[PDB]
Design a protein around this ligand. Structure first.
Ligand SMILES: CC(=O)SCCNC(=O)CCNC(=O)[C@H](O)C(C)(C)COP(=O)(O)OP(=O)(O)OC[C@H]1O[C@@H](n2cnc3c(N)ncnc32)[C@H](O)[C@@H]1OP(=O)(O)O
Ligand SMILES: CC(=O)SCCNC(=O)CCNC(=O)[C@H](O)C(C)(C)COP(=O)(O)OP(=O)(O)OC[C@H]1O[C@@H](n2cnc3c(N)ncnc32)[C@H](O)[C@@H]1OP(=O)(O)O
Ligand SMILES: CC(=O)SCCNC(=O)CCNC(=O)[C@H](O)C(C)(C)COP(=O)(O)OP(=O)(O)OC[C@H]1O[C@@H](n2cnc3c(N)ncnc32)[C@H](O)[C@@H]1OP(=O)(O)O
Ligand SMILES: CC(=O)SCCNC(=O)CCNC(=O)[C@H](O)C(C)(C)COP(=O)(O)OP(=O)(O)OC[C@H]1O[C@@H](n2cnc3c(N)ncnc32)[C@H](O)[C@@H]1OP(=O)(O)O
Ligand SMILES: [Zn+2]
Ligand SMILES: [Zn+2]
Ligand SMILES: [Zn+2]
Ligand SMILES: [Zn+2]
Lengths: 273, 42, 273, 42, 42, 273, 42, 273
């Protein structure tokens, strides 16, 4: 690690990992980043100059979600390459296993922002491959450290699935997940399944749950395993959901309603092709 | 100390060759995975 | 699946998976197996004949553990090839991912038996590679279906670690684990760690726990994660054990004392070389 | 229906060629894994 | 029987995808040869 | 083989091998080709129309050699892609081991023509990779069947080396050579070496010959072997040239002066970069 | 200077491990050639 | 090269190449070898002692050919491992591309000897794989330097084919051939084909020649090419043998009757299986 601290907007954020900022920018202990267009700089002088020069107050895409002060922007890597590359370099500072930074054309980026009078301030994001061979509805996912543990991570996951639903497709985050990634997804999956298993008056196969939620059969099964809703007969695992098991887990710390939730009506997005 | 050029073209120039590096590594891995899959499954 | 049922001793056991019993023995719906030497047969006539002919009442090895009616035998694959091959074919009926059946020379087998007036009756086993490149103190592990859910599985795991302890070595089961394998190990690991974290009056690093138990640092970490004893700072995970977290988990279903335990004094084994 | 020969030698004969099959497959995989490790790590 | 369009653009259109096919096969062989050279020389 | 005959200029030429002419052009028994721009056609009607429409009377490049009625044109595959692709498809009809047809940008083509009042009529060619990893001064080489056995093949080889000389580089044709390719080169190499070994008043190492001729040390050695000018001591081969061996081979069928020779003064070419 | 033991057993002992070395290299090459043939021919 | 000279029988022979004589025997400048059993030694003292101790006066196999003072012995690598390994180490001193020295069980060795009152003195040999995937009737072939250029090499080649004939099989030496190997085979092949093409009153296809001689179709074709007995039509090569071409080549240096020839009646060998 060479760059271990960044200045973005009014935040001083300590870097978690290495990021391959090009040339001599990778060797500087601190970097200054524009909170709107995400360009990186060596010196403070050029930062204080850029504030009164930059022509952006939002990410360079369509506002596809708006409720309250939350807005989500869709940025296509082909149309705004420079922006997404800068985002990916920023993102790598907090992701151990991020592989791509510059080949951004095949990717589409969904930026989470909080909006006020000044503009739309970046909170986090997730990236998504347009054509995924493994059916990955998320590639990397991130909530910037100052905004963490507010529920924004579970919003972004919930958001990625809402896209998948509107695409009539199942999806799963790129593996492997980090420890905080596992906790976030498992928490989200439990909440979704428990809400369905509480209300649904009918027979449910694992297949149905997948179609209802866009969660994969694999992710559903392992979620049900951790909720003690799977029994084992001759090696093979079969679903066993009871009103008692649902009731108990609803009161446990294994059930938690997300502080911030995606409201379907507030989504203003059309699926591609 | 010094003022920096933050024009798009500056970034486009120092990213272009790195963008090509990744594309080549991605072609390498696609071929490597395809070759591995063929060799083990026979 | 062609052979879906076996007769061994007085048990009729339904087969869970395929097993490559050679030639036309693989195509028979039912097979008869001697409970002592584990030889397989097509017809019942040859089974009822073999009972009054067989010259074994125990597995063909050293009795290395004896307490009450429990005995454990160490069988070297090089000395008793035929027996271990037959065991491996039997074993495959209940293991989805068992790969080796006939190359048994590099392996040593530890047979769990219940002993009475008649002899030592096979309950389960685990196999172990003499020279493991990945440090696997267990290759496959099995409790025969009629003996399952009595605690014998957790005994065999506990037994495998006792061997590792006496070899001044760390060890881990061969990955990947089956769903019942995961449950068994996680249950064992939790119990071991909780017993230590309850009693030890001193500073403990993950390194120490590994040396005390022969459990790998990886298996220790993930165990502690599930016991909520790991916090997260800048991505990296650090240990956080409190008397409250220990107390709470001791009363939970995440703590359970094994019904059958390895008694160190009753082990009569010398480590190799 | 028929009585079966349960002598050791019978089992040794129908297992010998299968024992050799596994040994060859084990040599194959050792080489395959070693080759994969060399190619990806450069 | 029929008159044929012999404009450049006609040829450019029916050759473009074949030109791409060869380029991909050339990348394949370059990688394949490089991999072979690494594996045998150790 | 599907297309086994072509009409080019006033020639009916029987095809030697398969050529992957695209789409349904590959399935026609006969194809019509313009002798100037080399475009291929299904029907005769479009050929007789094209004669009074085509705007070329030469290959689309620089005339880099002119003596008598012989002219050689340099065509860069990047500037005149369509032409070179058509040439490569034509060429494949007489080359068993030609691999490239459409990826012509990395190649430069040298077209041999006979010139009269009408235009410059294609006789043969050789292709050359701009950046060759193996140092190949020729990739494919061809004299069209109606022009064969006049000396034009040995002219093209001699021409390829003249380029190499002017580039201060050694060079060798792409291997493997066809039977007619071997005969042509061996014939050329013998003549060059014999002319030098007859006239040179000094000591010559294999290194010098290479620098004088741009022929590789390998091709020189094997040429000398066939001229009986190599003796063998403890496995290793050493040069042994005597006035007797030179004299004898000058009168043999192993020496033959090319009917058509490259005249250095008539070359009007500058080497690249 | 010194008298040497030329018994068969002496040679058998200093050749045994070299005989095994070659056998392993021969298995390596057989697999390597078979793998190369599969990958190029598809 | 560390060992550059050997003493075998009464010969001092300079080594052509490196040979991996084991341990510190590979580092000695000179080695002493028994001419009968081929064992190697560091010091002369042990050599002069071994002469009056060794129990062999021939190679350890069947005498399968005897005419005049020439005898050929068949040695199976499985039965006389030590001998063949020593032979292979000796052989490597004069072969650049010999790969095998110790894995001699799959090989059978044919030793050429001159016989007198003392014993059968090794002149050269050829090795042969019992089961060849490529159909190699010779693996390595060698005439020891002091015996070279007497015709013994062409005898050994002629001998290898006589074996192939008696096995109703075609065969070819392992490629690649050394320069002296090429000269020897080409010389032999020419002589065989010319003798047949002179005498045979009938139609001969390349197929027939192969069956008559056990020479491969490939080796036959290239031999005919060098004898100018191949014409070329549309790339493909067709046989063209005339009484003039046969007559001319019979008087040339391209025809030479071997000084020593295999006499079929004097062969006392049965083919295996
Ligand atoms: C597909 C992939 O790319 S995997 C990579 C995942 N992301 C990363 O590792 C990048 C760095 N980390 C992050 O950006 C974040 O930690 C994220 C994206 C995982 C979650 O962001 P947040 O907005 O903080 O998550 P959110 O507030 O929705 O909380 C989600 C869950 O994680 C838990 N959590 C988050 N941070 C911590 C922490 N430091 N310690 C313990 N638990 C935590 C929360 O308690 C919550 O679980 P709960 O529902 O049981 O309470
Ligand atoms: C390294 C490897 O080879 S991985 C392969 C693991 N083995 C197999 O899959 C072979 C088939 N399965 C088996 O042999 C057994 O299920 C084993 C070996 C995993 C465990 O055998 P048992 O003697 O039944 O285990 P034991 O009685 O000690 O119980 C261990 C835990 O598994 C749980 N368990 C066992 N079977 C079941 C089941 N059918 N459903 C739910 N839980 C189960 C028990 O509740 C116990 O957990 P707890 O401590 O929380 O109560
Ligand atoms: C690098 C590569 O691409 S290798 C591919 C070589 N080319 C091909 O195979 C394509 C088809 N063949 C050809 O185009 C021609 O045969 C070429 C290019 C090899 C030679 O073209 P030509 O103009 O006929 O050659 P040229 O008239 O200079 O004669 C060269 C030698 O080949 C000999 N030769 C040519 N054709 C024949 C034939 N059909 N039969 C016997 N000898 C022949 C000539 O006798 C002459 O040898 P010599 O000097 O001993 O008399
Ligand atoms: C299959 C393989 O292993 S390929 C390896 C071939 N062998 C080697 O390289 C090992 C070292 N070399 C040798 O042992 C020998 O040179 C051999 C085996 C090739 C031939 O042994 P010899 O008994 O000398 O061959 P022989 O006396 O039959 O002569 C064969 C031809 O080679 C020629 N020849 C042999 N040595 C030489 C030399 N130093 N210079 C020129 N010509 C030579 C002969 O003139 C003869 O050709 P000709 O019929 O046109 O006159
Ligand atoms: Zn900006
Ligand atoms: Zn028995
Ligand atoms: Zn034209
Ligand atoms: Zn001796």
């Amino acid at each position: 690690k060479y760059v271990d601290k960044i200045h973005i907007g009014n935040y001083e954020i300590d870097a978690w990992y290495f990021s391959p900022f090009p040339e001599d920018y990778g060797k500087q202990p601190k970097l200054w980043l524009c909170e709107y267009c995400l360009k990186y700089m060596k010196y403070e002088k050029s930062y204080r100059f850029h504030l009164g020069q930059c022509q952006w107050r939002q990410p360079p895409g369509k506002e596809i979600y708006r409720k309250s002060n939350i807005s989500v922007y869709e940025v296509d890597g082909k149309d705004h390459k420079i922006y997404c590359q800068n985002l990916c370099l920023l993102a790598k500072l907090f992701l151990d296993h991020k592989t791509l930074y510059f080949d951004v054309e095949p990717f589409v980026f969904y930026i989470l922002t909080e909006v006020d009078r000044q503009g739309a301030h970046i909170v986090g994001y997730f990236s998504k491959e347009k054509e995924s061979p493994d059916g990955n509805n998320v590639a990397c996912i991130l909530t910037l450290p100052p905004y963490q543990r507010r529920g924004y991570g579970k919003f972004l996951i919930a958001f990625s699935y809402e896209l998948s639903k509107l695409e009539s497709t199942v999806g799963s985050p790129e593996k492997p997940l980090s420890d905080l990634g596992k906790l976030s997804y498992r928490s989200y999956w439990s909440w979704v399944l428990l809400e369905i298993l509480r209300d649904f008056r009918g027979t449910l196969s694992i297949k149905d749950l997948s179609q209802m939620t866009s969660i994969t059969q694999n992710d559903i099964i392992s979620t049900l395993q951790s909720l003690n809703m799977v029994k084992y007969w001759k090696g093979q695992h079969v679903i066993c959901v009871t009103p008692k098991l649902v009731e108990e887990h609803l009161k446990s710390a294994q059930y938690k309603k997300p502080p911030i939730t995606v409201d379907s009506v507030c989504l203003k997005w059309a699926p591609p092709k | 100390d010094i003022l920096e050029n933050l024009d798009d073209s500056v970034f486009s120039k120092r990213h272009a060759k790195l963008e090509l590096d990744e594309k080549r590594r991605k072609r390498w891995d696609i071929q490597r995975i395809r070759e591995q899959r063929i060799l083990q499954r026979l």
